[PDB]
Amino acid sequence: HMIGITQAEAVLTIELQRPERRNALNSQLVEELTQAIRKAGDGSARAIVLTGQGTAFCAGADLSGDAFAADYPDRLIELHKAMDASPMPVVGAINGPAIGAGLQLAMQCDLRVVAPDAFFQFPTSKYGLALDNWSIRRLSSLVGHGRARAMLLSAEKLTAEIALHTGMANRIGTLADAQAWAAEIARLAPLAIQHAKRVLNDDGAIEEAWPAHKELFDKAWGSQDVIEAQVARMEKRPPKFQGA
Amino acid sequence: HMIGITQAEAVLTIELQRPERRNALNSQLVEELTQAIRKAGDGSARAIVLTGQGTAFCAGADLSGDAFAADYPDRLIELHKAMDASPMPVVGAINGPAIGAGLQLAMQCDLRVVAPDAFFQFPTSKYGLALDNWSIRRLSSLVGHGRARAMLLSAEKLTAEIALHTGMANRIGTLADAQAWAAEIARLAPLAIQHAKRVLNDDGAIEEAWPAHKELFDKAWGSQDVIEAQVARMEKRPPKFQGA
Amino acid sequence: HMIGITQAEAVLTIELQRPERRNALNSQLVEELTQAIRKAGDGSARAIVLTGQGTAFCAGADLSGFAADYPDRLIELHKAMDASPMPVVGAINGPAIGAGLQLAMQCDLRVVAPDAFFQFPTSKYGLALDNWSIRRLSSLVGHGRARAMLLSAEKLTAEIALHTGMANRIGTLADAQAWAAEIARLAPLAIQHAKRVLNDDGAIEEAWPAHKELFDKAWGSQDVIEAQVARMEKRPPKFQGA
Numbered sequence: 001h002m003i004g005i006t007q008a009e010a011v012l013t014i015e016l017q018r019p020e021r022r023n024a025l026n027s028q029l030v031e032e033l034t035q036a037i038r039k040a041g042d043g044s045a046r047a048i049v050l051t052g053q054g055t056a057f058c059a060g061a062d063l064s065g066d067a068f069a070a071d072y073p074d075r076l077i078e079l080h081k082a083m084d085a086s087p088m089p090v091v092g093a094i095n096g097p098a099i100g101a102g103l104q105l106a107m108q109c110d111l112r113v114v115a116p117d118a119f120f121q122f123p124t125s126k127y128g129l130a131l132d133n134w135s136i137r138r139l140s141s142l143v144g145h146g147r148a149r150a151m152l153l154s155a156e157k158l159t160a161e162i163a164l165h166t167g168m169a170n171r172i173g174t175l176a177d178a179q180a181w182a183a184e185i186a187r188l189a190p191l192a193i194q195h196a197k198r199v200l201n202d203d204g205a206i207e208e209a210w211p212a213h214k215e216l217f218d219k220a221w222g223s224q225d226v227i228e229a230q231v232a233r234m235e236k237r238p239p240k241f242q243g244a
Numbered sequence: 245h246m247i248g249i250t251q252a253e254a255v256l257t258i259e260l261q262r263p264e265r266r267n268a269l270n271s272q273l274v275e276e277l278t279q280a281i282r283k284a285g286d287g288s289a290r291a292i293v294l295t296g297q298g299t300a301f302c303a304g305a306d307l308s309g310d311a312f313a314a315d316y317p318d319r320l321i322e323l324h325k326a327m328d329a330s331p332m333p334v335v336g337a338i339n340g341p342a343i344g345a346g347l348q349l350a351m352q353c354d355l356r357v358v359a360p361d362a363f364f365q366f367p368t369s370k371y372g373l374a375l376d377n378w379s380i381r382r383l384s385s386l387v388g389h390g391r392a393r394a395m396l397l398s399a400e401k402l403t404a405e406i407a408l409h410t411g412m413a414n415r416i417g418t419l420a421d422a423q424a425w426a427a428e429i430a431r432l433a434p435l436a437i438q439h440a441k442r443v444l445n446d447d448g449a450i451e452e453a454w455p456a457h458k459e460l461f462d463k464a465w466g467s468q469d470v471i472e473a474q475v476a477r478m479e480k481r482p483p484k485f486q487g488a
Numbered sequence: 489h490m491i492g493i494t495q496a497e498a499v500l501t502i503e504l505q506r507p508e509r510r511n512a513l514n515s516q517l518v519e520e521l522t523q524a525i526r527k528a529g530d531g532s533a534r535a536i537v538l539t540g541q542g543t544a545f546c547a548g549a550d551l552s553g554f555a556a557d558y559p560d561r562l563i564e565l566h567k568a569m570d571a572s573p574m575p576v577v578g579a580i581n582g583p584a585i586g587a588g589l590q591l592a593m594q595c596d597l598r599v600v601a602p603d604a605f606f607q608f609p610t611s612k613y614g615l616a617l618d619n620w621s622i623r624r625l626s627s628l629v630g631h632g633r634a635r636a637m638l639l640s641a642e643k644l645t646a647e648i649a650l651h652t653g654m655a656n657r658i659g660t661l662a663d664a665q666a667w668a669a670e671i672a673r674l675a676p677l678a679i680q681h682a683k684r685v686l687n688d689d690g691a692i693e694e695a696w697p698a699h700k701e702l703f704d705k706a707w708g709s710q711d712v713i714e715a716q717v718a719r720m721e722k723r724p725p726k727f728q729g730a
């Protein structure tokens with residue numbers, strides 16, 4: 001009900017379809033993606049393109065109305081595990097802004113073909129949030145530690161142009177470009193690709209949060225500032241953070 | 245006496261004031277810098293800007309005249325510890341050259357706004373010495389392993405265009421530029437900044453030296469070549485090292 | 489007889505000499521190189537320069553020649569370079585591909601001719617790399633470009649190599665030799681320390697159980713046969729993932 005799926009010449013394109021929320025995730029969208037990823041190649045697909053409808057790739061998370069908000073985090077980890085464990089290369093066609101969970105998702109693709117007007121961002125410093133370790137480590141490998149520091153510590157946006165600079169975007173292109181490239185890849189040695197994907201993903205980015213990490217991470221999520229961020233956004237005004 | 249402290253709109257600015265020696269470090273300067281970091285936000289400050297007076301950010305160390313010079317190496321570790329552990333994000337305004345101890349200092353800053361004429365350098369292989377591991381890891385993360393190899397194996401300077409290029413510098417600009425950036429960050433959510441800083445610093449660069457590293461470290465520090473480099477300098481001639 | 493060695497004031501230059509097979513590494517070429525490096529500085533030299541003769545740095549690997557324990561030899565060669573007290577400046581004069589890219593990355597610094605390029609064409613031939621090749625490559629071009637070079641045999645040009653740090657400088661053999669001569673006037677102990685610490689950034693990594701498995705599946709696959717046959721006949725492979 002919330003995604004689209006088309007196959008053509010060995011490439012399965014999966015498409016987020018919540019353009020009204022700019023493809024913001026919730027319980028259902030994530031669950032249906034998990035499912036769509038696992039069942040790809042069933043199907044004689046050899047490659048996956050992951051993209052979005054309308055202007056954005058994925059603007060973040062929007063659990064409002066989500067009858068099942070509660071269990072949206074585990075749903076999300078499931079999505080990631082599935083992508084990680086997939087023998088298919090996932091070419092993300094980042095057709096537009098990738099923000100928050102949108103950037104996490106983008107980063108979990110195996111390759112990135114990026115639209116001229118797209119940008120990438122972790123605005124967590126704006127909402128008082130805290131990221132898991134994989135996000136922080138994988139971001140740093142993609143834009144370099146220094147840019148990573150500024151995206152994380154000051155909510156700085158990575159432009160398509162600079163994504164191409166750092167390697168976060170592998171190419172700048174359209175959906176069709178991404179799909180054309182995926183076709184080339186679908187014609188390569190799958191086992192070669194499967195080994196490489198796996199070694200690459202095991203570079204250490206998948207990291208258990210240290211105790212100091214889990215502590216500060218708990219402290220931020222449970223904080224009243226997380227509430228203020230949302231209220232202030234509700235009331236179209238700047239948040240007054242207490243650091244508490 | 246050896247540093248300056250001023251505050252504006254939740255931004256504490258700390259300025260190295262030993263311009264007659266190009267801000268080179270010693271006991272007093274290191275000691276006072278430590279006190280300032282720690283007592284920052286005591287205070288309503290939610291961000292620190294760190295910079296140097298005169299033409300240079302920090303040109304290294306000058307134990308000349310230093311009475312407590314024996315235990316300076318520990319004092320220096322404490323400064324880094326204090327910075328690493330501050331909940332305050334630290335914006336380095338690199339107003340000019342950062343060499344040796346100063347490059348280290350610059351790297352311990354959380355973000356870097358670099359002046360067009362500033363440059364970075366570990367002239368280590370010229371003076372016959374060896375770095376701690378952190379210095380090498382954090383460098384690699386910021387300029388990339390390729391460029392770190394050159395800076396370290398051939399004492400090559402990193403100009404500001406290239407620092408902007410790699411992420412070593414987040415922006416190119418003035419003390420003022422950095423301060424206005426520090427003002428924006430000071431309005432972000434403190435607890436999200438603190439979590440991300442901790443995890444970013446725990447990327448593995450704070451690494452204990454392997455056995456063979458400490459053997460090469462001691463051998464270099466205890467070499468005849470360390471003296472040759474100094475006398476050759478004092479005689480304005482090419483040094484002629486021995487590997488000993 | 490398969491490499492050239494010359495010395496000019498503290499700089500020892502080793503040249504690969506199979507331009508007729510674009511400097512591809514075989515058992516004897518691998519052997520003599522290992523030796524040359526071990527016996528370097530014996531010898532007043534303080535820096536080494538490594539380059540290939542003709543148009544290529546190293547086109548890859550070549551088991552033409554009684555060479556089954558070739559994989560061990562090729563590992564000793566890297567063990568030798570990693571262990572060498574002297575810094576090795578790679579004058580990458582032409583394309584470095586496969587084992588050739590591996591050899592280039594084991595150099596300590598790289599001066600790259602503007603016409604060279606780099607490539608693991610490993611996904612075209614259904615093969616798998618050792619972990620170090622993948623870690624060092626990521627360190628040198630960034631994780632993002634490494635995924636591309638690894639998952640679709642993307643070539644890295646001298647220009648982007650310069651951009652990412654794979655290439656320190658774009659220049660000639662002469663340029664590399666001049667740079668080595670400077671490096672040979674710096675403090676050896678300081679250089680030895682840095683080299684060791686840098687090489688121990690974690691890239692020398694043992695394959696996990698899962699990696700070793702996929703590695704074996706790939707190497708022992710039929711798709712390897714199909715890749716060689718398809719290549720030989722200038723035609724697209726029809727892989728099966730088996």
Ligand SMILES: CCc1ccc([C@H]2C[C@@H](C)n3ncc(C(=O)NCc4ccc(F)cc4)c3N2)cc1
Pocket residue numbers: 076077080081084104131132133134135206209213214215217218
């Ligand atoms: C194994 C492949 C893989 C699995 C999971 C992930 C990421 C995806 C991301 C949405 N995400 N969000 C939270 C988590 C996650 O791991 N949460 C548990 C946790 C506990 C204490 C902490 F301090 C931090 C995190 C996670 N894991 C990344 C990669």
Ligand SMILES: CCc1ccc([C@H]2C[C@@H](C)n3ncc(C(=O)NCc4ccc(F)cc4)c3N2)cc1
Pocket residue numbers: 320321324325328348375376377378379450453457458459461462
């Ligand atoms: C925990 C945050 C942190 C603290 C300290 C450091 C750095 C700062 C730098 C000035 N610095 N200088 C010497 C040391 C240092 O760690 N010296 C001990 C040592 C022992 C054997 C060796 F082979 C090498 C080093 C150090 N550690 C980096 C990060």
Ligand SMILES: CCc1ccc([C@H]2C[C@@H](C)n3ncc(C(=O)NCc4ccc(F)cc4)c3N2)cc1
Pocket residue numbers: 559562563566567570590617618619620621692695699700701703704
């Ligand atoms: C210690 C310095 C060093 C030594 C060796 C290597 C590289 C060089 C490359 C030619 N090369 N080729 C095969 C191997 C290699 O490591 N083969 C053993 C192996 C076992 C199971 C696996 F899944 C993967 C690999 C290797 N290691 C890199 C660095």
